[PDB]
Design a protein around this ligand. Structure first.
Ligand code: AZA
Ligand code: AZA
Ligand code: AZA
Ligand code: AZA
Ligand code: NA
Ligand code: NA
Ligand code: NA
Ligand code: NA
Lengths: 295, 295, 295, 295
């Protein structure tokens, strides 16, 4: 037998950092969960019990805190690139670092219509994430994403003209509820190293904001022919607005809301044009994915 | 042996309702999870296999949908009271109904600074809840609550002067992070029946909004001596602003963020006044509760 | 305003303890999650910012570890009583301690048909729990429970003869699937203090085992007329077998498995006597509760 | 822009099936959660709103139930292959089906030391899973796995001789607790189609059982030098025992249990050889992965 692939490291490292503006008194907080996995010339730790090649996962944890102390933690694309580069430069036998970061929302509170200097609220479980793969001699690959954005529209969604055969019971519809949890990922062109990532720093926050905006606007405004058709429109616009993105991927559950026929009870009308009360279905759900790139 | 207490019904009934304004085209959605448990002269179903006394839980489910079809579902205090009253009036042998409702947020989207007529976002997992107990001959008891409101302040929290003995290792502090998930419940004076609940309908939404506002403002502005002291201030203000509330209960986890000593690494300073990077602790957590009533 | 009720302490304190038999080499592990909440003359911490009355929750955490170091942690009824008694005896102004313990399963592994001295498996998420309330001058009240026991029987469950009215669509049945998650609690007669709890130590493990056995046997063997009727039979037997129990409470979800009509597809027969494939329903669910005491 | 990749289908389809032996009266139940995603010539549904190419996800759901009605559902490797083959044969424009199945445990109850004919218990959340990719013209690729197997050993684990530098605080140890949740996957040699899968049917259950046994025995018996070294030993043995497996992958969290120094309290000794009470850590955790193949 032989080791075909191996990676190891520390997962679920929670980190909080505060920045204090001495002049204005304003404080800004960041909270993240970080995972770092390393690859390299570490096969002998598996095959020969040779621990000499192992950077202990506890040391990886220490490194994450130290790096957060000495560097900005925002945008996460930059922080992940600094962290990943550290491991490949510090350790001769480590040749790839894989860094995943989940950013948690802490939104500044407005009290009496003014921004509070040091109080924050978690407005939604929506996350901003990055995956950074730093590979010695091959640069830095970054995938940025948003996840956990849950939306619903109560009309202006249709689904008709699909294939009908002996397995089909679904009725065509010209007016339905559409609800989904959005997972969207944009993959950046490969960067040669940290200098190049630094040169593009302003684009990261801007592109995240654009991706969010395009997602929300398109969902709200499209008279949707299907999840497939609406999601393609989203991806198209993101690629148009940021030339440094190579591909956009969306993965969308279709969370069903079923009509409830109440006609058995005193002829109560609650279907089609008369539908007011629906039963949200926890499962099963549609799952629709697409990866869109450039011509 | 004897049956000392019994209740039964249907839990986790998910309901969505849409209202369509024909004039303006504007649609408004409500989504809830409902539990209804009944009590009454039902002992023989347990002791003698006498199912004749059982209103099937499937029928309870049907009733929830039918009631939502025929009545407003907001404020939840009113809907729960209608639903509970139904069971005690319809069934001679049923003498109490216990209705729990969890309201899920669907917030209207703003697209280009204008409210969208039919698109919604789940902004946070914060819930608005009610517990309604309708007891034949004893009226309607309503407890309203908000839960899942997660906040953090990065300074202006202290904790010193606590009891110190041979079990104590905690250092006194004059500057710490305070973060919690807020669970707040206000209990209404007993209502004589549905007519009285209807007469107070405008107070329900107003009091929920007030409770939320007081919670957020007090948390942000109090130079907190302890969780205990800050939560008492909140409860005091709510009771002052709504005479029809008898008691306010808060239950607050104290979610710890620990300093990380980095001095072992190149004398790096990251404690006390130099603390910038902290380790959020998933567990254990403080849990602090108080029920405040009128003198 | 006045403080009507208050309690505070530490939740989610995870504890592991190992016992090593020097003679035999055999090791036995225990893992628990503990919550301790205190009550007493602590109102001024809420109303006057007087921290002098507060035993810090961090100290409560220390106390739990110290108590586990110096005492047996099994049965949990004894450990909880020791822990609760500690607080009311040590602190003059603390008059009640509320201790909740969840015991996690670590079952010794059998390797080649022999018990391994030091390796364990988590066989199921079933828990054994206790709630111990130690109140100065009123003794020790203990509720023991098992939870998270999930069972299913594929036949020998019926449900017919229930009330039918204009809200009813449910068909009567003489053969259905019954599946539930069992939550069973037995409440001990009040104990005068720790000496009395110690005198009954062997009964705790025995009664837990009996409750589990009675639950499983009755469920498997009863030709069930309803969840209500079957659960009553369980509670009856437990009360018969342990005179020191005052009441038994069961809380049982009825997790539905629906027939799927496939006759639309090539006349496929999959209902009634021909039912083979079913759709488990995640929600809604029946919820059936009973508390049984002595005549 | 262009569609680079696309797949869509139905997730979280819960299925139960019962087999009734008429002769013996014995019933056997199977419960699974299934996901089916399709690929093929479906780009126009995204780019041109052409629904004519879409097999509705609701139809996919129907197909899963119909296929379960007409075929055995065990072993899951066979069922997944039948289901995936169906879609590529039935629909000309569908060229790949991806089927994921999670099997839930329903273990027959023993009542009074005899197997019950129709009553079952969920003993643990351990799962048996399969991923089946059926690609037109390229055969059937099957990955089988077990997941959610949680184990702990209280001694006979060491970790010393790792790299020490200015980022390292971890002390070397010759005796520690090792606990993990096991995720193990074995990938079968490619099969040419359903006939070949059928010819190997007895190997699927046997190999699952072997993988489980090897995992448990090796964990219990290895005087472990590291997670890396122990997991390699497991993978080696599985590959030796089943020639039709090409690779074995393990992914193992290292769930830490920390010593608690209690010496500050009355010189209490609870570290090193005196360690009895430990604090399980919910996060962070080590994460160690390896893929082992043949020379
Ligand atoms: O078994 C281990 N492997 C590792 O890589 C490691 N790192 N810290 N502790 C550890 N234990
Ligand atoms: O056992 C049952 N008890 C009930 O109360 C009920 N209601 N619907 N189905 C049911 N099954
Ligand atoms: O606000 C606090 N209240 C408490 O009771 C406590 N105990 N430890 N830390 C604490 N902080
Ligand atoms: O938007 C949809 N896309 C689909 O592929 C589908 N299948 N059923 N319903 C559906 N809705
Ligand atoms: Na390197
Ligand atoms: Na009545
Ligand atoms: Na006392
Ligand atoms: Na095909």
């Amino acid at each position: 037998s032989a080791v075909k692939a191996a990676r190891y490291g520390k997962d679920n490292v929670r980190v909080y950092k505060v920045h204090k503006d001495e002049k204005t008194g304003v404080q800004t907080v960041y909270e993240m969960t970080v995972c770092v996995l390393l690859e390299g010339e570490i096969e002998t730790s598996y095959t020969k019990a040779d621990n000499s090649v192992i950077v202990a996962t506890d040391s990886i944890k220490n490194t994450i805190y130290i790096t957060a102390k000495q560097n900005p933690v925002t945008p996460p694309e930059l922080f992940g690139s600094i962290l990943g580069t550290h491991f490949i430069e510090k350790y001769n036998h480590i040749h790839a670092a894989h860094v995943n970061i989940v950013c948690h929302r802490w939104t500044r509170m407005d009290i009496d219509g003014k921004p509070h200097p040091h109080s924050f609220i978690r407005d939604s479980e929506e996350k901003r994430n990055v995956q950074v793969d730093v590979v010695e001699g091959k640069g830095i690959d970054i995938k940025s994403s948003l996840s956990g954005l849950t939306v619903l529209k109560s009309t202006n969604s249709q689904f008709w003209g699909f294939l009908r055969d002996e397995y089909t019971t679904l009725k065509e519809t010209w007016d339905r509820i559409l609800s989904t949890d959005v997972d969207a990922t944009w993959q950046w062109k490969n960067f040669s190293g940290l200098q190049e990532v630094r040169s593009h720093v302003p684009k990261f926050d801007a592109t995240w904001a654009t991706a969010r905006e395009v997602t929300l606007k398109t969902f709200a405004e499209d008279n949707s022919a299907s999840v497939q058709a609406t999601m393609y429109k989203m991806a198209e616009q993101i690629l148009a607005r940021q030339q440094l993105i190579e591909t956009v991927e969306y993965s969308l559950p279709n969370k069903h809301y079923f009509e409830i026929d109440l006609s058995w009870h005193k002829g109560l009308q609650n279907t089609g044009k008369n539908a007011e009360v629906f039963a949200p279905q926890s499962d099963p759900n549609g799952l629709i994915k697409c990866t869109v790139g450039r011509s």
